[PDB]
């Protein structure tokens, strides 16, 4: 399908950036998670990044580690995440859906079968966080065979040859890291270096979404001002879940209010 391409062309016309929340599927249970996700979309999410719970999430900080642990405490498996993704797609036919995966969950019982499953449920992209471009051949091949975009990462660390590989191998969107470290809202990243955004554009890479440490509307506006196509916020959204576990109604209300404020700031 062409969901990312369609989204970006539409935002471009509207003079808008994308606002993309992340949550962990199944946090804090299957039913409430589905409600959170519909809430995120109703509140103006342009795309989704959705994490599958993983036992040892080495690119994640404590907030998202505890989101993983909540889902496991609800008994959430990858199979149940796939059930959720199918239901989410059925409700929302055009929103681009990206997964945040760790390699072992993709490799577990077959790389090909993993991407085939993503295609079946209507996922658009997969970002495997611990597979660098150097190791990515079997992943990108399987992704493309099943009409899934493989997402690659552009660090602030990025040299030229990496820029070119990322532009060639990646599809859908290019990920722009805000900073080194792991996910977390209490570690604020830097302004998107306008060097990389320029070079990415030069090499006709998929449009960039900046991620890590984005937790405020001011940071979303800033990413767009910097030439990025959009911004991803995970820990900030997850902390609203964490704090409202005994108040699932207030949880949703707060999610709605925050997402709306973040999306409003993406309008240029």
């Amino acid at each position: 399908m062409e969901r990312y391409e369609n989204l970006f062309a539409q935002l471009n016309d509207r003079r808008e950036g994308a606002f993309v929340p992340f949550v962990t599927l199944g946090d804090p249970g299957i039913e409430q998670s589905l409600k959170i996700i519909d809430t995120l979309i109703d509140a103006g999410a342009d795309a989704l990044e959705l994490g599958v719970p993983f036992s040892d999430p080495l690119a994640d900080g404590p907030t998202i580690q505890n989101a993983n642990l909540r889902a496991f405490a609800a008994g959430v498996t990858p199979a149940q995440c796939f059930e959720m993704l199918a239901l989410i797609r059925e409700k929302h036919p055009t929103i681009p859906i990206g997964l945040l995966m760790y390699a072992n969950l993709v490799f577990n019982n077959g790389i090909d079968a993993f991407y085939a499953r993503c295609e079946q449920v209507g996922v658009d992209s997969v970002l495997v966080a611990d597979v660098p471009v150097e190791e990515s051949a079997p992943f990108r091949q399987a992704a493309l065979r099943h009409n899934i975009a493989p997402i690659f990462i552009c660090p602030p660390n990025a040299d030229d040859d990496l820029l070119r590989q990322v532009a060639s191998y990646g599809r859908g969107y290019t990920y722009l890291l805000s900073r080194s470290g792991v996910t977390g809202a209490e570690n604020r990243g830097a302004l998107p270096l306008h060097h990389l955004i320029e070079k990415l554009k030069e090499y006709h890479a998929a449009p960039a979404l900046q991620g890590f440490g984005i937790s405020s509307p001011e940071q979303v506006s800033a990413a767009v001002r910097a030439g990025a196509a959009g911004a991803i916020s995970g820990s900030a959204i997850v902390k609203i879940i964490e704090k409202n576990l005994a108040s699932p109604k207030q949880m949703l209300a707060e999610l709605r209010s925050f997402v709306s404020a973040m999306k409003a700031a993406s309008r240029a």
Binding site: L58, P78, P132, P155, D159, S180
Partner: protein, 394 residues
């Protein structure tokens, strides 16, 4: 692109976030340079000899093989400064850190011998050091925690997951991924992303080199087999490496069987896991049907790890090395036997290797065999654990 092969057959690789690839490439380049630099080699050899106390003895057992056709030697890594083989490759990696201009060290530890090693090397060589340790291991290996702090290292308890070595490794890598500009990650086993399995092997290979010279001197022939415990794989690959091309020499690696393989409470992924991708490498690991990483178990903290280094997975695959397991109770008997009959108190990790050699002898007592066990560490750290068991045992 890399200078050296990151894989051993199908195992190994560099499965880290893209952010970390420059750090790995820089480390590999520094290591390749250092390996060909006579000054680096002289500095490393000087520290090993005059600070760490190499070469270590090879001790013939006087008493435990009586009445059999086994001749058993113990490679005395328990006599190395710090009390275990971990000291060797820390001194090399600390010198690499310096060559690269890094001023801080990160390390993980289970038994606390790598943490002790990292802190002592950091004190000697003027580096600021921080050590991750699972909260469970903080407790069962507590002599080591005190040691680390006295040497000016920060020791950080990890409460996540099993609160053991795998959890310490996770936090160490989380940390490095934010701190690599100024910190070298001093990984303490022959596992993790390339180039660590290779560097750790090369910085431990004097174990086997010495063993070979010593056994030729004393016996006039190579061993029938060399036997080493396997957690992540450093002491074992250090003993094995110089013998790999000596096809007559058996290479036997011993994983922890814990309460027994059938219980699922063990640390023997090479033989009783399946291939996965975790901690920057493709390797056998203990995992759920769905590919969540399983928590391991061993009486010994150093072996309590649900993966294994990729070179061991490769040597097993081609049949060059054989891997077996030993249970907590087998390891405890070997511990007691060595204390009582040779006056050496072995680490509970090393006791697994000894227990397998004792089985090789006892099962076939008229088989002529010349064996070396890598006595990877001393068991001072374990005396409270063994006491508490042997008491509650009656």
């Amino acid at each position: 692109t890399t200078l050296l092969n990151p894989y051993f057959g199908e195992f190994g690789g560099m499965y880290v976030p893209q952010i970390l690839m420059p750090a790995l490439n820089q480390l590999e380049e520094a290591f390749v340079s250092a390996q060909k630099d006579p000054e680096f080699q002289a500095q490393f050899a000087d520290l090993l000899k005059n600070y760490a106390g190499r070469p270590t003895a090879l001790t013939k057992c006087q008493n435990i093989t009586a009445g059999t056709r086994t001749t058993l030697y113990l490679k005395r890594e328990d006599l190395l400064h710090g009390g275990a083989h971990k000291t060797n490759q820390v001194l090399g990696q600390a010198l690499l850190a310096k060559r690269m201009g890094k001023s801080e060290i990160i390390a993980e530890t289970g038994a606390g011998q790598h943490g002790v090693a990292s802190a002592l090397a950091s004190a000697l060589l003027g580096l600021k050091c921080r050590i991750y340790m699972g909260a469970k291991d903080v407790e069962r290996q507590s002599p080591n925690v005190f040691r680390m702090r006295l040497m000016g290292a920060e020791v950080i308890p990890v409460h996540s997951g099993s609160a053991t070595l795998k959890d310490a490794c996770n936090e160490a890598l989380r940390d490095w991924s934010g701190s690599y500009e100024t910190a070298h990650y001093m990984l303490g086993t022959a596992a993790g992303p390339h180039p660590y399995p290779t560097i750790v092997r090369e910085f431990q290979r004097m174990i086997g080199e010495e063993t070979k010279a010593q056994i030729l001197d004393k016996e006039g022939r190579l061993p029938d087999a060399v036997i080493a415990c396997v957690g992540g794989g450093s002491n074992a690959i250090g003993m094995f490496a110089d013998f790999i091309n000596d096809t007559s020499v058996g290479l036997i690696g011993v994983e922890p069987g814990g309460h027994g393989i059938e219980t699922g409470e063990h640390g023997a992924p090479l033989k009783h896991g399946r291939v996965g991708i975790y901690f920057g490498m493709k390797a056998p690991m203990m995992q759920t049907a769905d590919g969540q990483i399983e928590e391991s178990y061993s009486i010994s903290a150093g072996l309590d790890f649900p993966s294994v280094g990729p070179q061991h997975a490769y040597l097993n695959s081609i049949g060059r090395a054989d891997y077996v397991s030993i249970t907590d109770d087998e390891a405890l008997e070997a511990f007691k036997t060595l204390c009582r009959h040779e006056g050496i108190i072995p680490a509970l990790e090393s006791s697994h290797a000894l227990a397998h050699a004792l089985k090789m002898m006892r099962e076939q007592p008229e088989k002529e065999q010349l064996l070396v066990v890598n006595l990877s560490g001393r068991g001072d750290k374990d005396i409270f654990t063994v006491h508490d068991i042997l008491k509650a045992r009656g």
